[PDB]
Each structure stands twice: as structure tokens, then as C-alpha cells.
């Protein structure tokens, strides 16, 4: 059977055209659950239109894998919220015979507009963000892709788009590779 992927995020996964990517990269079907400003909790909620395809997904389609991409300071800001999202999503995956994966993102980019205003330093977001996917990982089972540790080797100006949040084509083509040899 063709490997089959439902990935489940915001447009971090949507941007440049990176589900196609990892299709073409994996030779994958990719079926994606996005809306930008979505947060992971809203697939858990069928009163959502993604929680209602999340739902309906898992009941009447076959899959390999779920990828799942939290809002991008989430982990960070609200990690409680985040870690009981991955948590029961990971637990629906399984349950319908499918691997999750967590799509871990990465710290904004240090001294960016998003991140003045969110009132942290660049190094606690760093850890608060690496701690809550390493911690999701362990207690969930779920795959992780850890998408910071590359952006950390990795020149900045070219992986950022210019907001120091959103991934330029480049840092989406990382995500990809990312993700394709996590799930490969």
C-alpha cells in the first residue's frame, strides 16, 4: 500500500508548499488539517471543523502516520495545553493503527518583533520549546522531528522568513527533510 500521512498544524506545515514536499519526498499520499492561527486542541473538539475531519479521518481512512504541529510558541507558553493535546491525539493515532509524529518547531528568531512581545529571552524559549517536544515524545510515543536542532546549526537569515516565526522556503524545505527522514 501507498504510505499514507494526515498531518494536522497551522502554516507552518501549510507554507511553501511543504506538504507537497514531503509527499514527493516519502511518494506519499499527504492529507492535511490546517488553518493558520490553529491550535493542536482544536482536533480534539469535533464542534471544530478540524476537530470534525480530524475525527472523521481517523474513523474512515486508513494511515501511516499523524503529524502533529502545535502553535508556534505554544509549547512554550502554554505547555500544559500542549502536552495534553499531544497526549490524546497521539492516543487517537495509535488507537486507528497509525505512528504520531510530533513536527517539534523551532525557537523564533532572537531578537524578532513576535518575540520582544512575548516578554521571553530567546534561551528560555529555546529550552521551554525543546523541553516540551522531548517531553511529549517520551511520554506519548510519538516520532519526533526535531525541527530546532537543524534551524540551531543552520544559517538564520536563510532558514526565517522575515518575521523571525514563519519558515522561508528554505527553512520549509528542512522541515520537510526534517519530517521525511523521521517517518523514512
Known amino acids: 500500500n501507498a504510505?499514507?500521512?494526515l498531518m494536522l498544524g497551522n502554516s507552518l506545515t501549510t507554507a511553501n508548499h511543504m506538504p507537497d514536499m514531503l509527499a514527493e519526498l516519502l511518494?506519499?499520499?499527504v492529507r492535511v488539517h490546517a488553518r493558520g492561527g490553529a491550535r493542536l486542541?482544536?482536533?480534539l473538539n469535533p464542534k471544530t471543523r478540524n476537530g470534525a475531519l480530524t475525527q472523521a479521518a481517523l474513523a474512515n481512512e486508513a494511515w501511516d502516520f499523524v503529524v502533529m504541529q502545535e502553535m508556534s510558541h505554544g509549547p512554550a507558553t502554554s505547555p500544559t495545553a500542549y502536552a495534553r493535546s499531544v497526549a490524546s491525539l497521539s492516543e487517537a493515532a495509535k488507537a486507528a493503527g497509525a505512528q504520531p509524529v510530533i513536527y517539534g518547531t523551532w525557537p523564533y528568531r532572537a531578537g524578532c518583533?513576535?518575540?520582544?512581545?512575548?516578554?521571553?529571552s530567546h534561551d528560555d524559549?529555546?529550552?521551554?520549546?525543546?523541553?516540551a517536544f522531548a517531553q511529549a515524545a517520551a511520554d506519548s510515543g510519538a516520532l519526533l522531528a526535531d525541527v530546532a536542532a537543524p534551524f540551531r546549526a543552520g544559517s538564520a537569515d536563510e532558514l526565517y522568513a522575515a518575521d523571525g516565526?514563519?519558515?522561508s522556503p528554505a527553512g520549509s524545505r528542512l522541515a520537510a527533510l526534517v519530517l521525511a527522514e523521521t517517518m523514512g
Open 113 to 120: 518583533a513576535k518575540l520582544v512581545k512575548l516578554g521571553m
Open 125 to 131: 524559549m529555546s529550552l521551554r520549546m525543546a523541553e
Open 3 to 5: 504510505m499514507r500521512i
Open 41 to 43: 486542541a482544536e482536533h
Open 27 to 29: 511518494t506519499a499520499e
Open 165 to 167: 516565526v514563519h519558515p
